[PDB]
Amino acid sequence: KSEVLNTSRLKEMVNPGDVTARELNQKQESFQMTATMVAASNYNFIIDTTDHGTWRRLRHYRSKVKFCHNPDPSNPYEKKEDPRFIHEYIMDPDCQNAFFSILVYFWEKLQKEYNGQIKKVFCPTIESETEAYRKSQDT
Amino acid sequence: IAKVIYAMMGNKFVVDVDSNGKYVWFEFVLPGQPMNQGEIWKWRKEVNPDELHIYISENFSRVMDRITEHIKYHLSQPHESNILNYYKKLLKAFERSKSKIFNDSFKKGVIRQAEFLFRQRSFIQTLDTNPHLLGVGNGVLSIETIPAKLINHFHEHPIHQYTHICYVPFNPENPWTKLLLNALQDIIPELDARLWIMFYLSTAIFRGLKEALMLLWLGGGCNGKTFLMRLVAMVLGDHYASKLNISLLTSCRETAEKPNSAFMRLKGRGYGYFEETNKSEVLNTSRLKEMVNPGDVTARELNQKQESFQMTATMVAASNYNFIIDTTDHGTWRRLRHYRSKVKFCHNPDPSNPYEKKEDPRFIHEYIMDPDCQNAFFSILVYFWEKLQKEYNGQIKKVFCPTIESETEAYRKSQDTLHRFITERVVESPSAETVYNLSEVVTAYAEWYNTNINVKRHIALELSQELENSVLEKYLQWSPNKTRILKGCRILHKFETLQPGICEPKNKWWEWSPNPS
Amino acid sequence: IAKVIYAMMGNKFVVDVDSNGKYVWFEFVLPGQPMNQGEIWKWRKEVNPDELHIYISENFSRVMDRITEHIKYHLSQPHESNILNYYKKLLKAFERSKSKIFNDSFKKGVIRQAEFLFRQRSFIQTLDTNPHLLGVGNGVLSIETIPAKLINHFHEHPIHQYTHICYVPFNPENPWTKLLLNALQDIIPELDARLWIMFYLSTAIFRGLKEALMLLWLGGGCNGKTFLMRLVAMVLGDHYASKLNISLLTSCRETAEKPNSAFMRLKGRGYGYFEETNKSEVLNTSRLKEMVNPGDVTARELNQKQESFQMTATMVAASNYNFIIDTTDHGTWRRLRHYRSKVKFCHNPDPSNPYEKKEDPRFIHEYIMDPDCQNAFFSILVYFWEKLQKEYNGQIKKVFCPTIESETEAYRKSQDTLHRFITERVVESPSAETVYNLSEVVTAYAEWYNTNINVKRHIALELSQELENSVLEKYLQWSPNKTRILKGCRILHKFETLQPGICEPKNKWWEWSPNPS
Amino acid sequence: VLSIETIPAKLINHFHEHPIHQYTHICYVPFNPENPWTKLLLNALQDIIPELDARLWIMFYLSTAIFRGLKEALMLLWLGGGCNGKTFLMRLVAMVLGDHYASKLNISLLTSCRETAEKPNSAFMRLKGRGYGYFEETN
DNA sequence: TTTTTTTTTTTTTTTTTTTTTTTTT
DNA sequence: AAAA
Ligand SMILES: Nc1ncnc2c1ncn2[C@@H]1O[C@H](COP(=O)(O)OP(=O)(O)OP(O)(O)=S)[C@@H](O)[C@H]1O
Ligand SMILES: Nc1ncnc2c1ncn2[C@@H]1O[C@H](COP(=O)(O)OP(=O)(O)OP(O)(O)=S)[C@@H](O)[C@H]1O
Ligand SMILES: Nc1ncnc2c1ncn2[C@@H]1O[C@H](COP(=O)(O)OP(=O)(O)OP(O)(O)=S)[C@@H](O)[C@H]1O
Ligand SMILES: [Mg+2]
Ligand SMILES: [Mg+2]
Ligand SMILES: [Mg+2]
């Protein structure tokens, strides 16, 4: 369901800096994280803060397609599921090869255009959906 | 010597490095050698190659004597000063080396050296990967093609796990098979439900990817569900079937990350069953969807590091108490199935109780100890899986059964506290309006099922939208301050008042009948 | 050398690999050698074959001497130039090899080499598996056929565990047997109950699958329960009996924490007992029915992995505090039997108290360390087991005893909080209408026994169906809003105002009397 | 080694065959009331407990501490106040008997209020072979 | 209830081996 | 000087 969270080890992983913590059964060595984070859910996240910096390093979106097994013409923002589309199509290595090619091509496009600055690109939906969250989530 | 031995008996031994970095020897079993029951025509794990140790001391001696004989024969023929000293020195050195093969330190060194020669890269991780091969007492059974082929001869399949249940082709004429079929028909009266449940159970033989379906059905207190669960688990074997904790799904409790030996279960297993519950159990997403979907999952080796094991076993949960489900998502209530039994065995069965019969006290205490019973059950399961493959091509969701998915949807119409409150307290009484942002309604609903159903921590936002996920939002506009105030209801308390506002099989049912069945 | 040794005395030793992957040595004990008490005619576990080391260093010497005579005897007879050098060289080589056996490094390698020759596959897991064989002080006891036969000579039974109680044929004329029979009869005045209890205790000697039955009996505060409980365990031995903690059966709800050692009892133990409790306590748990049933169970013990073992033992729970039973499962009630003691030994026994006698201070403090007491008592139990097999063919449920199952069913009519409340506030006062939905009846029933009986987490199921599982459903309808509103009755919390609306044996009882008895 | 098998007790200071290994470092001598220490202890002991019958009964109970076999189930607890000298008597016996046969256990154990689940417990141990257990004051 | 006990080591080679120079062929 |  919906989850409540605020700065609870949030900014420590948000920033590209360095943190450190328990290492299984040891003390620590170092944590230089470089991985992109994504958190998709069907329940609204509860945030209770007004820090400008936290909202600065945040993005929000909301998809509008909810496929149905009985899709009528009156439902434009949904279609028919393919049960095998998730159950299979991942086992075929050719699918991963094609997806990897797509990812490499898109990364090269990003490097060519905005030179590695993800925030340099402009998307009307992006930020707008994020500031919409800012407009919300404020008791 | 290691090279000679590898060239000599090298097709029978395989050495591979374990997960801990220790070399392990595997032996290929053949008839006519000391062995455990049911371990024929397939590989086994060996601590040290003992029979290789006796082999290097027994069989190599004949080759040694052949070399000695050849040397002596060459010495016999007339020659020149070469046989004066060279042949004699070779004979002396070879004689001194002959006894070396018997030395224990020498033998250990030879074995350690030949570990590298017998090394075969990429062997452990490809063990039991084929799901169409199942280990059996009389060899290996292949279900890749219909009909399934029993292999009792030489092969090259990487099969090591097994069960000690000998396999025979499905023979309905067997007395034990007929008795089991009749008993199974009696336990579940409906033909269509019987067939559907048997087809679902036959999927436990397979070990590959399967459709994400969960079976959970109710039954009588003395129904006999646990008999079927224990029988299936016994027939499949420990390596493929294991008894998981019913509460596990009901209560996620500690995270999988937290040391869990049950998390090390479901790895390679083909069966996991839930025991009877002492009472009704509530569960929702408490490691539910993780066990539901067939995707690969991690593997927390108790206190050790975090592995990843693929899960494919069939999960079944049987109880005499219902289970509390608190959710509305269609996806969760689309990979579940429900059924209810109707047989409550009695030791004084009057004619006025057709939906029950006399117990057999020895039906559970014994009748599992007979190996013939497991053979018959295994044949039945194999035959049913073959029938499913023939008809629906492995698609369990494709088979139709009217009584099933009807009890399931009936259960879906139940186990919904929100609808009870709706068509108990507000519906049929819309002729008023008292709503404080539905917050009063949320609190009333919460306290209502706190005493009515159960007490638990609440979140205001869960009903902030679930109210619109009902028939309540038929009249809900909002004030200038929004507040989404409902436009009609009546908060009712106490008594108040009503204020204005299938076909029976002919002789055989295992024959499945034609496609309509 | 190892080949010669195995061909010479190889039948006396067996080498098998343990579960941990370490070779283990087993020696068969024969009379005429040192041994621990009660370890005759059966296999024993030995870390190092010490008797073998002295055997290869002493007994093997004479075989060496026979070689020494043979070579010189052939040397004595005149021959050609072969005896000039051949016999001389071999004799020098052999005498050099003579002293090699007395070396230590040489002997270590011999033992390691002989581990392959003496290896016997599938030997540990088939040890102590036959339930009809019991290790006794004077050999091994077989209860396969009536009468039970004691084997005290050579055999091939794979038996390793034992108890140190020497067996003698049952003699009722023995003074210890006479005293034990008299005291035991006085302990339980009822003949039929005495017959029923002894038969149940007789199954403890068995080590195979048994009828699922739980014994618990009540009575006097100082009856003498622990005397009989201690005697059976002491006689039947530690290897087959264990002290079981009551907290395991009375754990709150959790199945097990990640390690568990107490539950790993009953692995080979054929008997476990439960003692007096601090106070009346509830025991309705998962283990209430999970442990009692003959189905196999699995658990983990710390470093030991999470394996399974068949529960094979008889459970008895004697106390003076009545156990709080709260369930409606007829299956659970099947496993349980109840009895009440009626003897309270007193230090001032007057004739006006026939249901008691004088204590014997030395009855428990001593009379146990005497081996003859154990031998006589064990004979009594063994005789009973043969007798029970003769009459009821080893079926404990089919034995008849009028006083048992009568006090038990009277106990069943108790420990029913709901039924007690039924004829307390609503029944006998049905002429009113003050019954809302079942939630209010849940609350009303909850608050009653909250102080009258105990506090408990009142979940919905306690009356969501028990209303139909009662006598109050005769008038149970639902409104247009459903709600299952009862037709109503005088709830009337509290009770204010009125409510409107055997045969004594002649001289011997172990003779059991004829079949009716 | 001191033998209490037969009356009177006999001391073995020569060769024998009894498998005994544990001991205490207190030398044994025949009981002589004429020793100044024997009189000194007896006088103080007599003053500690005034009643003759109680004095006899208590010390007869404590005399069983030498024995190491099975004993009748008797629990002795008694009340005092202030500097009553109770600690003196328990402490004297413990060292006299020695650690191999006497030991001190947590007073909480006596309370029995604490309950132990499936978990290691050490204070329950140490009672093997001993013949004397003494406690102290509580909160 | 982790917690710390449990785990998990943790000795792991070591001796030896060979030679051994002398001896005695 | 080479083999034990
Ligand atoms: N086909 C059958 N013919 C004869 N007896 C049967 C048959 N099927 C079941 N029984 C008996 O009826 C009972 C089966 O129901 P139960 O086993 O009591 O129900 P359950 O689901 O197994 O829960 P349990 O076993 O009570 S914990 C057993 O006593 C069986 O021996
Ligand atoms: N048949 C008998 N003849 C003589 N004395 C007996 C007999 N049976 C029991 N006693 C004695 O009477 C007492 C038996 O009752 P209790 O021992 O007080 O009750 P209990 O169930 O044994 O509880 P505990 O464990 O002994 S405190 C013991 O002192 C026995 O020695
Ligand atoms: N028999 C005795 N002869 C001489 N002095 C004694 C004797 N018994 C007790 N005392 C004195 O009284 C004191 C003993 O009392 P305490 O040991 O203080 O009290 P307790 O009851 O043993 O427990 P504490 O120590 O007060 S918590 C010592 O300081 C002794 O000097
Ligand atoms: Mg059952
Ligand atoms: Mg007792
Ligand atoms: Mg003091």
User: Cα(B377)–Cα(B379) distance, rounded to whole angstroms?
Assistant: 5
Q: Is B379 helix (H, G, I), strand (E, B) or coil?
A: helix
Task: Find tokens 């919300």 and name the residue.
Answer: A136
Q: Is C7 on the interface with B (CB under 8 A)?
A: no
User: Cα(C380)–Cα(C231) distance, rounded to whole angstroms?
Assistant: 12
Q: Is A62 on the interface with B (CB under 8 A)?
A: no
Q: Give the ligand 2 atom nearest the CA of C275.
A: 25
Nearest CA among B28, B1, B34 for reference residue B13: B28
Using DSSP bridges, classify how beta strands D102-104 and D10-11 pair: parallel, antiparallel or unpaired: unpaired
Nearest CA among C40, C144, C368 for reference residue C235: C368
Q: Could you tell me if residue C394 is left (phi over 0), alpha (psi between -120 and 50 degrees) or otherwise beta?
A: left
Using DSSP bridges, classify how beta strands C314-318 and C271-274 pair: parallel, antiparallel or unpaired: parallel
This structure was determined by: cryo-EM
Interface A:D, ≥3 CB–CB pairs < 8 Å? no
Q: Could you tell me if residue C495 is left (phi over 0), alpha (psi between -120 and 50 degrees) or otherwise beta?
A: alpha
- Count each helix (H run) and each strand (E run) in chain D, helices first: 4, 4
| DSSP secondary structure, B88-122, as one string | HHHHHHHHHHHGGGG-HHHHHHHHHHHHHHTB-SS
**Looking at the DSSP assignment, which residues form a beta bridge with residue B281?**
B323
Distance, C-alpha A39 to centroid of its chain: 5
Residue–nucleotide distance: B258 CA to E12 C1' (Å): 35
Any atom of strand E under 7 A from CB of C302? yes
Q: Is C299 helix (H, G, I), strand (E, B) or coil?
A: strand
Radius of gyration of chain B (CA): 34
Using DSSP bridges, classify how beta strands C23-28 and C13-17 pair: parallel, antiparallel or unpaired: antiparallel
Burial of residue C495 (number of CB atoms within 10 Å: 0-12, 13-18, 19+): exposed
User: Cα(B23)–Cα(B111) distance, rounded to whole angstroms?
Assistant: 12
Which residues of D sit in the known binding site for ADP?
44, 47, 83-88
User: Cα(C140)–Cα(C151) distance, rounded to whole angstroms?
Assistant: 5
User: Cα(B1)–Cα(B113) distance, rounded to whole angstroms?
Assistant: 9
- The answer to whether the beta carbons of residues B249 and B228 sit under 8 Å apart is no
Residue nearest to nucleotide E3 (CA to C1'): D119
Collect contacts of D42-51 with beta carbons under 8 A, ≥24 apart: D48/D85, D48/D89
| DSSP secondary structure, C301-361, as one string | ETTEEEEEE----EEEEE-SSPPB-----HHHHHHEEEEE------SS--TT--S-----H
Name D residues 119-138 whose Cβ lies under 7 Å from strand E.
Answer: 119-120
Name B residues 243-282 whose Cβ lies under 7 Å from strand E.
Answer: 254
Q: Which mutation among D47, D84, D90 tests ligand 3's pocket best, with the greatest number of atoms within 8 A of CB?
A: D84
User: Cα(C509)–Cα(C515) distance, rounded to whole angstroms?
Assistant: 13
Cis bond before residue B147 (omega within 30° of 0) = yes
Using DSSP bridges, classify how beta strands D2-3 and D102-104 pair: parallel, antiparallel or unpaired: unpaired
Nucleotide with the nearest C1' to C257 CA: E1
- Count each helix (H run) and each strand (E run) in chain A, helices first: 5, 0
| DSSP secondary structure, B121-147, as one string | SS-STTTT--TTEEEETTEEEE-SSSS
Task: Find tokens 């003859």 and name the residue.
Answer: C372
Cα dihedral angle (D61, D64, D66, D68), rounded to 10 degrees? -140
C-beta neighbour count of B240 within 10 angstroms: 22
Resolution in angstroms comes to 3.7
**Residue numbers in C near B321 (CB within 8 A):** 461
| Number of residues that this document lists for chain D | 139
User: Cα(B264)–Cα(B275) distance, rounded to whole angstroms?
Assistant: 19
Q: Which residues of D55-87 are buried (b: 16+ CB within 10 A; e: fewer)?
A: eeebeeeeeebeeeeeeeeeeeeeeeeeeeebe
Q: Is B14 helix (H, G, I), strand (E, B) or coil?
A: strand
Using DSSP bridges, classify how beta strands C43-46 and C23-28 pair: parallel, antiparallel or unpaired: antiparallel
Task: Find tokens 């209530």 and name the residue.
Answer: B333
- The answer to whether the beta carbons of residues A23 and A91 sit under 8 Å apart is no
**Looking at the DSSP assignment, which residues form a beta bridge with residue B457?**
none
Using DSSP bridges, classify how beta strands C314-318 and C214-218 pair: parallel, antiparallel or unpaired: parallel
- The answer to whether the beta carbons of residues B57 and B107 sit under 8 Å apart is yes
Burial of residue B358 (number of CB atoms within 10 Å: 0-12, 13-18, 19+): exposed
Query: Which residue does chain B place closest to C298, by CA atoms?
Result: B243
Task: Find tokens 């032996």 and name the residue.
Answer: B27
Query: Which residue does chain C place closest to B260, by CA atoms?
Result: C258
Task: Find tokens 């205790």 and name the residue.
Answer: C201
- The answer to whether the beta carbons of residues B429 and B487 sit under 8 Å apart is no
Nearby residues of A39 by Cβ (< 8 Å), 6 or more positions away: A45
3-state secondary structure string, C62-94?
A: HHHHHHHHHHHHHHHCCCCCHHHHHHHHHHHHH
- Count each helix (H run) and each strand (E run) in chain C, helices first: 16, 13
- Amino acid (1-letter code) at residue C417: T
User: Cα(C385)–Cα(C183) distance, rounded to whole angstroms?
Assistant: 20
- The answer to whether the beta carbons of residues B26 and B15 sit under 8 Å apart is yes
Any atom of strand E under 7 A from CB of B145? no
C-beta neighbour count of B433 within 10 angstroms: 12
**Residue numbers in C near D115 (CB within 8 A):** 247
Which ligand is the nearest neighbour of the Cα of D89? 3
Alpha carbons within 13 A on the beta-carbon side of C451: 5
Nearest CA among C168, C197, C167 for reference residue C185: C197
User: Cα(C164)–Cα(C143) distance, rounded to whole angstroms?
Assistant: 17
Nucleotide with the nearest C1' to C301 CA: E6
Query: How much distance in Å is there from the Cα of D66 to the middle of ligand 6?
Result: 23
- Amino acid (1-letter code) at residue B209: L
| DSSP secondary structure, C366-430, as one string | SSSS-HHHHHHHHHHHHHHHHHHHHHHSS-SSS---TTTTHHHHHHHTSS-HHHHHIIIIITT--
User: Cα(B300)–Cα(B257) distance, rounded to whole angstroms?
Assistant: 6
C432 lines ligand 2 (CB under 6 A): no
User: Cα(D5)–Cα(D18) distance, rounded to whole angstroms?
Assistant: 13
Query: What is the DSSP code (8-state) at residue C11?
Result: G
Q: Which residues of C104-113 are buried (b: 16+ CB within 10 A; e: fewer)?
A: eeebebbbbb
Q: Which tokens hold the place of B485?
A: 């105030």
Helical H segments across chain A, by residue range: 11-14, 52-56, 83-87, 93-114, 125-135
Nearest CA to ligand 2 atom 9: C224
Q: Is D74 on the interface with C (CB under 8 A)?
A: no
Q: Give the ligand 3 atom nearest the CA of D137.
A: 27
Nearest CA among B136, B128, B122 for reference residue B157: B128
Nearest CA among B299, B237, B234 for reference residue B266: B299
Q: Is C112 on the interface with B (CB under 8 A)?
A: yes
**Looking at the DSSP assignment, which residues form a beta bridge with residue C316?**
C215, C273
Any atom of strand E under 7 A from CB of C257? yes
- Count each helix (H run) and each strand (E run) in chain B, helices first: 16, 15
